[PDB]
Amino acid sequence: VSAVVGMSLLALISIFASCYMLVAARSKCLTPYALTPGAAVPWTLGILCCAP
């Protein structure tokens, strides 16, 4: 029981950390385009990441 609980917890924290850091990478790649007045994100980068 203890081993299963520990393994599940470790898998969950690994998945969460990976997802959060990938989200951070997205948000840091697409952060300057929201600050530039006018202009627009390229369609390719706006497809490989969801760009509002």
Partner: protein, 438 residues
């Protein structure tokens, strides 16, 4: 040639010892422990038995008075009573109606059975171990009696053996024990000269034949009833019978580690604890040179059936290619699986059958037929019987090999998660390097 190894101190468990020196074929030793004894050194403190009270005939004096003097006897109690008028079957005993006196005395002495029924009080000290081990190799099969203390050195077919000392100093006996007939007890006892009436040790003697005695039984006299000749006395019953009634539970039915306790002398047998080290010095006549030993090449191993049970639930087959007929030595190099045979006959056909026992779901071990080695991996299913009458013939290991099914699944899951994490790390590092370049 010197060698060293350790064995588990469990009775009946076969143990294979592998030796290997340059320029000779390997040799396999088998040593088994038949029985063990643990004996503590005892110093007697005192003994106890049922007591008896000696009441002599009272002294009655007509028309006079008597006084009585003390004597050096155990619990000597004497009193003089005045104004007594004894009666007998004929009539009165003395003329004087109220000028008489009576002297009554009594004391306590040990029973006439103390030589046959007594309980001893001891004090246990550091204990020694004796063993009876059987050795077997080549064409030698003998059993010897050895002292497991690192001092004894016995020779068996030209080979010196030195056993011990044991890895753990554990003794079931407490500091103070009491021995009676066939049982022993871990109970404290009152110190000599301070016994208490009605309990254990109310009558103490330094030894069986000693002439001194300590008795404290609360012997009180009483005045005789009028018109009668008798000595009355009230005395607390024997403490030895009281102890014999609800002494408690014996160590024989309480000793841990499955230890059989016998007396005369006080000793504990077949205690399963710790592991003994063995040092040996084998001569050059017991080996065989590499030239006159068969050469084995291309050795592979396979397992037919496997059921991890206390018996020898496993059959494995080795295939090989040899050059002459002869006999080799086999051995398993891991404690996961223990073989049954030590020497096997090889021939030109190239197939042998071996029996092994294990306690793991998926065992992995390396066997060795003469100078060649191979690896074995198997999958075993649990047995169905719940209770068995014989002891386990396998070392208790349950951790499966890293290539087993469960560890295989955990490896795949871990690999997938690690790949995802590594990809995320690489993506972040590339994006941040591009961002910093700006």
């Amino acid at each position: 040639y010197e060698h060293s190894t350790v064995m588990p101190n469990v009775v009946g468990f076969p143990y294979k010892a592998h030796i290997e020196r340059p320029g000779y074929s390997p040799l396999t030793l088998q040593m088994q422990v038949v029985e063990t004894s643990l004996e503590p050194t005892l110093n007697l403190e005192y003994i106890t038995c049922e007591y008896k009270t000696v009441v002599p005939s009272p002294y009655v004096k007509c028309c006079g008075a008597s006084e009585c003097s003390t004597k050096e006897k155990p619990d000597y109690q004497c009193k003089v009573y005045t104004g007594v008028y004894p009666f007998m079957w004929g009539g009165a005993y003395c003329f004087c109606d109220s000028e008489n006196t009576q002297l009554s005395e009594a004391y306590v002495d040990r029973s006439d059975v103390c030589r046959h029924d007594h309980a001893s009080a001891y004090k246990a000290h550091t204990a020694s171990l004796k063993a009876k081990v059987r050795v077997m190799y080549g064409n030698v099969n003998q059993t010897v009696d050895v002292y497991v203390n690192g001092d004894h050195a016995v020779t068996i077919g030209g080979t010196q053996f030195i056993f011990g000392p044991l890895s753990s100093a554990w003794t079931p006996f407490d500091n103070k024990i009491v021995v009676y007939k066939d049982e022993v007890f871990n109970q404290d006892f009152p110190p000599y000269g301070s016994g208490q009436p009605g309990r254990f040790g109310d009558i103490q003697s330094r030894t069986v034949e000693s002439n001194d005695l300590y008795a404290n039984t609360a012997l009180k006299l009483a005045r005789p009833s009028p018109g009668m000749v008798h000595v009355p006395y009230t005395q607390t019953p024997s403490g030895f019978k009281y102890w014999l009634k609800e002494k408690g539970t014996a160590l024989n039915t309480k000793a841990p580690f499955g230890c059989q306790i016998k007396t005369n002398p006080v000793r504990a047998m077949n205690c399963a604890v710790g592991n003994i080290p063995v040092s040996m010095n084998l001569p050059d006549s017991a080996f065989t040179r590499i030239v006159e030993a068969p050469t084995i090449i291309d050795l592979t191993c396979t397992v037919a059936t496997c059921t991890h049970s206390s018996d020898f639930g496993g059959v494995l087959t080795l295939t090989y290619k040899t050059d002459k007929n002869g006999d080799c030595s086999v051995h398993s190099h891991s404690n996961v699986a223990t073989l049954q045979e030590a020497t096997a006959k090889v021939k030109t056909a190239g197939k042998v059958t071996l029996h092994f026992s294990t306690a793991s779901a998926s065992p992995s071990f390396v066997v060795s037929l003469c100078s060649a080695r191979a690896t074995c991996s198997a999958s075993c299913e649990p047995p169905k019987d719940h209770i068995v009458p014989y002891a386990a013939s396998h070392s208790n290991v349950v951790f499966p090999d890293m290539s087993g099914t469960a560890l295989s699944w955990v490896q795949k899951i871990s690999g997938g998660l690690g790949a995802f994490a590594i990809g995320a790390i690489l993506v972040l590092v590339v994006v941040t390097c591009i961002g910093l370049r700006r």
